[PDB]
Amino acid sequence: PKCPECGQHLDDPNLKYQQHPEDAVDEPQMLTSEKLSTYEDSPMHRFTSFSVYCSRGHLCPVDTGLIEKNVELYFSGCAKAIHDENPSMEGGINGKNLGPINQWWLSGFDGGEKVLIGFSTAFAEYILMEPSKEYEPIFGLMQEKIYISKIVVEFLQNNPDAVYEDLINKIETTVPPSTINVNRFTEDSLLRHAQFVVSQVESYDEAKDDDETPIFLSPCMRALIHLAGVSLGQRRATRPTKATTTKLVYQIFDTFFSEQIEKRRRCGVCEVCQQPECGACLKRRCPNLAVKEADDDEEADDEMPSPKKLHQGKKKKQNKDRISWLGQPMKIERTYYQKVSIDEEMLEVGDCVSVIPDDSSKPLYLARVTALWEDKNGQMMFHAHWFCAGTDTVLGATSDPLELFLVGECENMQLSYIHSKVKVIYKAPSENWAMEGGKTYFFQLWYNQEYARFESPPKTQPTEDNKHKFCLSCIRLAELRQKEMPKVLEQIEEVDGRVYCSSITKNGVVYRLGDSVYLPPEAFTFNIKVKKDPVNETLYPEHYRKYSLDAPEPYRIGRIKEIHCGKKKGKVNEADIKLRLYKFYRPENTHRSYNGSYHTDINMLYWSDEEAVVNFSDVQGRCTVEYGEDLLESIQDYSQGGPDRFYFLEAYNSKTKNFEDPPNHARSKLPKLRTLDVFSGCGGLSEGFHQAGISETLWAIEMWDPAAQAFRLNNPGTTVFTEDCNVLLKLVMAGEVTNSLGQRLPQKGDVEMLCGGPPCQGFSGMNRFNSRTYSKFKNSLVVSFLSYCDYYRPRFFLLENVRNFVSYRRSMVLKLTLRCLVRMGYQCTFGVLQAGQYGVAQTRRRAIILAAAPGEKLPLFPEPLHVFAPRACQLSVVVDDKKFVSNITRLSSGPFRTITVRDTMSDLPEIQNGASNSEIPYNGEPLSWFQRQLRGSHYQPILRDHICKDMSPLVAARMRHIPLFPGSDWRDLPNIQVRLGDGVIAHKLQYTFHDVKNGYSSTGALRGVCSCAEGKACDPESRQFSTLIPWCLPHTGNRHNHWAGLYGRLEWDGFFSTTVTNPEPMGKQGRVLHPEQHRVVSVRECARSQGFPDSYRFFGNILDRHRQVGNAVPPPLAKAIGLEIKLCLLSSARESASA
Template identity: 40%
Template sequence: MASRLYAPSSSKGTKRPLSRSSSETKTKRVKTANGEFLTNGTKHNIEGTVKCKFCYQIKPEIVSIPSDAEIECIVLTNDVLANIYTDKLDVISHNITNYSIYDENGHLCSMDSGIMERNVPIYLTGYVKPIYDHDTCIENGIAVKELGPIFEWFLTTYDGGSKVIIGVCTEFADYLLVEPHQNYKKYMTSVIEKIHLSKLVIERILDNQESDDSTYEDVLNSVVNSINPATNIKFTEEDLIAHAQFVLDQVIEYDSTAEYRFPLVDTQCIETLTELSGAVKPTKAPRRRLNIRRRNTVKADISKREFSKATTTELVKNIFENMFAAQLDNDGDKESEEVLQEHVKTVFDDIRLCKYAFKRPPKSNKKIFIVAKQDSSTDLIIGRIEYMFQKNSATMVHIVLFMHGNKTILGDTSDPREIFLLNKCTDININNVIQVVDVTYKKPCKDWFNLGDSKLEDITEPINRQEINTFFFQFQYNDECARFEDIDSSDIDDTMHDPNENKICRNCVKENLEKKSQIPQLLEYVEKKKDLYFFYNFKLLNETYKVGNFIYLQPGIFSKTSRLNFVEHRSFVLNDTKKNKNSPLLKNVDETEYPEYYRKTLENSMRGSNESTPDPFEIGEIIAIYVTKGDKKNIKAIIRRMYRAEQISNDKSLDMNMLFWSDEEFVIGYNDIIAKCYVSHIANIKDPMAWFVGGPDRFYFKTKYDFLTGSIVPEYKLPSKARLVGMEVYVNYNYSYVKEDKIQYIPAHKKINPLRGLDIFAGCGGLSKGLEDSGLLNTEWAIESDDKAAAAFKLNNPNSTVFIEDCNHLLKLAMSGRKTNDKNQKIPQRGEVDFICGGPPCQGFSGMNRFNSGQYSLFKNSLIVSFLSYIDYYRPKFFVMENVRNFVSFNKGMTLRLTLRCITRMGYQCSFGILQAGNFGVPQTRRRLIILAAAPGESLPLYPEPTHVFNKRSSSVNVQIHDKKYRTNCKYDESAPLRTVTVYDAWSDLPEITNGANNEAIPYKHKPITHTQRLLRYPKNSFAESILTDHICKDMAPLVQARIELIPTRDGSDWRDLPNKEVKLSDGTITNILMYNYHDVKNGKGPDGELRGVCDCASGMACSQQYRQNNTIIPWCLPHTANRHNNWAGLYGRLSWSGFCSTTITNPEPMGKQGRVLHPEQHRVVSVRECARSQGFNDSFLFYGPIINKHRQIGNAVPPPMGKAIGHEIIKAISKKSQMYK
């Protein structure tokens, strides 16, 4: 039985009239292609014409009815039709061909014109055939007239089939429409278009749903590459926008039949489509307007996709099932807050009722854990008594504080019996002690790495849960950064100090050492000159600074401090590093020609600009260190200023780490110092690029900058002392003639034996590529279900085993003991995998802080759970999980908390943080959640410090969950060592191409221009191939391409710069002029009284899309909805050479989420290679498949430079552990 999807009812609200009188609408002049001016009345207002009262048409066509046609009730009695019935209860269904639909005046009309919603009867004529006869000819058909009235039309397919069928309902039967009459075909064009568009959209979303949340760009790509069956040409974006309301209604209808599935209407795609088109999102599935006799359950015609059931270990499964069991009510719909709170209650509530008082020191010398109240606060604290003492005749106890899991980032997901050691302590009066509790330290099992996929009964419980006042701890917790780390052995000592001995608290010792490190200590006295005492070095924050060291200083410090030499001279004015050479200053334009330009402001036109990007750190050389006689604590330093290349030159070819020597000297305070950096004269290093990539914070210089004249001094005039800088450098070089105390030890990137890695949800391999570049791992295995992305991974990792299959199936095989999969590929065994990385695709679930039953079903079968089960089964030494920034806010943090709970339950140390890819040398804003985890006994890595400054508006990496803010360990929050990377830095050497360029291998034509390009083309300091691959771009439809060509090549240009005129397209058609017939109450009228609205909704009335305008240079949908969407700033936007890209997505579309996807100068969208470079992929990295697959591989990837920075930090952690055991 074919299932059916019903067509939507009419939109709600007041209907607008077909036309307005000239007195209602102000005449607006628009320019045609030949230069003539027309008024809007010429196009829209037709005076003296009569409309049909039924179909509202001014010049209707008359229906052609067969001469031998009979009415419906007679036709249905024909033996050919009557003999096919088998059940009196069956709905009678027939086919009808050569059909036409008409009103009571005999006028042809479309059933999709809104006529049915106005309760106007319409009828069908044609030739009726039995349901089994699908022949389109009229032979053997029975002529019919006045079939109806039609009270409903519907869509249906045969289950599993691809052909969409349209049906209509009358009082007596259903009729499936086979072929329209020749004169009626044009009336079915819109109907057929919207039906097929709905099918394409729903199918595309379903195809993506298991792996990711479909974006507008994903769906649009499927649409524009599909043939419109009504016209036999490809669909366009205009078609999708025009029929958005119908598509949305069908999505709602499809959702109404779903069980335990993420609603399609909540996907990114539908949200964006709704915003762009101004369509109204119904709250429930639409139903027909008439009294329908048959109240069948409506089922979607597109086959249901079943979710891949997650393969889980018992531990992971237990975590989620226990958590959700407390949330889900019996009916699977309601949520019980009381039950949830009972499940996670802290047990302190029971302790409050205890009358126990702790009055005297215990006889045992074992440290005691207590619950107490502090001051007047009602919150209870838990702590471990370190010692007791007397204060003002009162007995006091000094306790190290612990935090209950409910108060950590874990929140409600925590184990009610688990507490966490804090790096804090306090004193309390013994009378405030409420209860003594039993606390046990949970040691990691010796065979921890072999416990993956253990049975729950085999996992030893640290406490007896039958006893109320029992707790355990296994981690130290940093409340500011949400870091769970192993506890130092000294913090586990549970022996109480003798009251007669010194009162020692290790937290106090650590705190005192920290405070001491913040006070500078002068070392190696040199001499006294007048009232100044000079020293050779000093120590601050455990770092020693000595004369000759180079240091980072706050940006702009040299303009705030006094120059020590050349006091009477004024220095030359430096370059403004933030100055935009092509600034898009607003100008006066003719609003008749550019009717949307008024929407532009500097604030919303400069997206992707570096105007607010901070400068990198200033750099100086310590020449002297001194204190004055009366102020010996205030250490001063005399600094030689080093100039950055961008401060004195506009030459974009200069390296980012290139400096200029100067004779300028300044005095600074020790508090102005940020950190050390390392500088050498170019003659003292082997190669600038090798020097740069070999370690952090490395710079070089060639010549001197004369700050008085603003000129660069020839290299041969460089002072001899400057040439010696770097002679003392020791970086695997043997300078045996250099004195030991002169050697400048330069930290290099540490090297280790690479770990054996598994990349899950590998994509093309961006994350693992970066980790490999750091030297951390060899990716021996990868899992990717998309065959094109998997092929790309294999191209770049030929020695890796790539599993092209569902990760759940592979894990199931591994857990069952299989050594190989169905393709005879060797499955990694436990003990072989040292490292796992991956970014499990994550649905948005709901906006609630807890799940209902459907969302629970989604989550427990989600790929996040699968990823965690891989971790639990293989138990790698380290793992990295990556996801979108919004992961932290899904379900108000519940998704993140559950993930961290699972990780800590396994015994992993872990932390989470947000990193901005732009801070690591890519010209793109891309914030990502990164979870770092280390096995017990390993050292938990820190998050990498930014290497490049980036736009401040896009650099917020702090996370707020409920009322608590979390940050990473990073200290460089205001600036960074290097300047930002721009679009020019990344793309300017690429050859010029045109729209639709498809040559996958072309010559470079130019040598690298910038530092970034040298890194991308010579990734290992070896000469790259002279052939450039994948510099190809999408072929845009004629109308879209015409718009692109009319977007000015200046910064900040977008759709609001488009002219309103007729244009001849490349396919020979001519565009329409967009008509402004309505008053815009928000924006008023133009300077000459021009109307600014394209729909009644601009006047505050109900929106009606029946007068939508198509084929216009200015897309009708943008001014239609601009007032409520920030004027759609950035759509059809050009990128700026001096700016950065929006987050690179899977499909560059001018009206997509990314918006700014036009090349700064060329009339096309960005190419595959340009997108790859914006992500930091070097030019030797290959992608696979059609162009849309390549874009998707890039857009889904983690930028390799960010992965590389993470890898260096993990290597540091591994080296730190090695040092501890030496």
């Protein structure tokens, strides 16, 4: 038996019938009482001892949607004076069967701790107070629901951009009052109330409206929507940051607005899609569409062939009047060079010209007249070194219509193709350019299309043997062809039509006999060597979902024995340079294989008497393979001394599979820049830079206290400013010497290098800019950061960001950043790097913007040192449908093996879920090479931050029950009733519906967790909570790739999905459970995943430490970049050491 009106099952032991007061009169009568009377027509009244019930007398909830489902609900209790705050049944009239509830509503989501619950009837609006003793339970749950909703709304008003793991933490950590009979809230509760909470939050945006972003569209909100299948649109309840910029930086962002700035996939089936109309108002917009759009704005598009070279390209001839030479010829060559030519008016060498092309792609071609001459066919010729227009560079629209750029484009042309003489000025930097922080065609930098490098022009020089032919574009190409040229330097004595040599060259590297060489895994070979059963589906109902590229080998190493080659007609054929090498085994290449690749050094080799022949083309680079037993310093000291340094102590007998000693033929300052790390964090970026020996941080700016604190502990000589960089900048700009706290503010000339990670939050999307999006970026921390650069003018600049920075806002964010630096007159470039390729067991791509002052050199992006899964390695950038790449050649292979989770944390003592002891002994030695380095050669007794979050009894239980086999997640959980330690009991998942797309289990059992599996609309109450297999995961599984690896354990041979900031198992941060322990990863494990030395200190609570680390730039990546700035400095030091 179950009610025809409300639906309640009569056998329900928690059912209750309506119990009435005496003086209870019908609604119109009780509303005519004199005990009764904001800008509306009601009348509004208070209401106490209330009870809500169906037409038959069953006490009913109001949240459940029965009002919506047309079910007439009647209420009863004491009504009071609008002003009467007493919830004691005393100053009012009792009403009975009070009008069917037209609708119910809420008010109290701002500067108001109280949340009011009102009902609307055919006659009056009532404000509820206390329920009746019989209704109390029913109102109880409803109340709890309302509270989570409040916490969720309030938090989001204060923190939009909040991620799912934060929401969870906000909820988790909020202490509810006594008035709410819940000890504390959990992810389980939020997920359980996920529909009420979301539908409440939607309503807050519909109600309190601004031109601002709907709170239901925040990352955490959409995350909760996708995780717990939620129906959007079921709504009901109603009732000027400015960047501290310099004139120059302001001007750029101010003009882009006053130029390039101009201004429907509705769902149909939703409750918002079924409601008219607006000019009654200005909003009726679909929430399901709103999400799809909000989600698509988050994703980019990463193949595409090389961009076409400019000016190749058709130009059209002009004049037939009088072109005659002027003066005596400069020189002779079949060609006769001149200095002046008169095409009606005077035209000298080194003047600029305009060339009218074919009326199609219509920009006017611009060129520097390099040379003037007459060819053997008496035709008047010229050499046109082309200029690139601002719009034709990466910059595009962002550039000055008058700014031109020098390119590696030149061609010979007849004097007919010339249109006119054009005034082209070189906007050279001032004598004092560093102090400068706050018409016709001009130029400033040299642009390399292939690598988006804006650089300071050479200058020069024109020798008297080429003062007539002087083409920089021709010189560059010549130098390039020379380096790319395989050439013999010294030869011994020739043999059977092949010359034996002692030294060869290519790419700028000189290869001698005995020097070691890198080659692809295909280059040679070593002496090689040579079905699932039935799962219990009753126990593992979700395993069916389980169903349904990897890193290459590092370079093959060889030592040079012979440089024999080939011969062409008379002399040596460079196309035929061959090498005879002694093959070097890596421990992995031995019979040992993967066990060799464990505790061994990343750079240890095994000598072999084996030999191979390979072309000098196949050679990737040169390295240093030395015998350690004949060594000057320790193996560590030699290894840590410089690049491409390997060693061998024994020799591998490939045949006997044994280790003999090797044969006897196998035997033998840096100016640290004064740095300012803006958005310093705990100092991971500064760390890699200090590791590089190229810097010293003297001023670090951190807004968040726990981070700045952690910085100081690692950098004691740094003036850590715990402010908003915007106030800090305004003070120097105001002329201050010191801040409130009496700390010396950095002054112009004090900062040699600027570096930082400006967080992009108010505009971090992909779609076209807009009035909203632009205003947010106009004042962004990117613009505050570029102002710092403009004011201070450091020798070197770095802006590290999220890889998508490069793609953000139809790549406009990157185009404007590059524009800024060019306006100032800085050499600059962008580029993407995968941290994993730099010695970290994590897959994280970062956008890196390098900038360098005119005078210094522009650094290159570091060559990858570690072999990584190709998928994780897409570094290319498509800007305005042109593919931009970095100088990185190693695409592809690398010199060292991959760093794995195993190498990252295999040595750490066992810790249980909820570990709290900050300082503990290691209780053992380091095992991996990686461990040895972060633990250090110097003995450390204490292990720090091996602290791990305390997960709930339920989550804790779930983790115990996640198998240890690689790549194991939720889908492996058993459907078993776990005793949650405490009174609470995690029960089985009830499988009551049919999955029409997944079928039946092997046992003929159902797979459906909710009515929507059938194709119908989700029936609530079919929702389950506190289940071992989270109910929400089968609920949405199908539409979200079976919830990938949520509750997944890290693979020992795997990596970290990303930079983990708050480890949650159903989180957007990847696999977070430890490979073997029934817990989530500890702070130190994360710190290790970042390649931080075990000495590295962290401040605040567990979560602050977690944030500090997952915010950091991994020191290995920072050092890699720092090392590129290293060469850039030494090179510029020897260059500024002449006569």
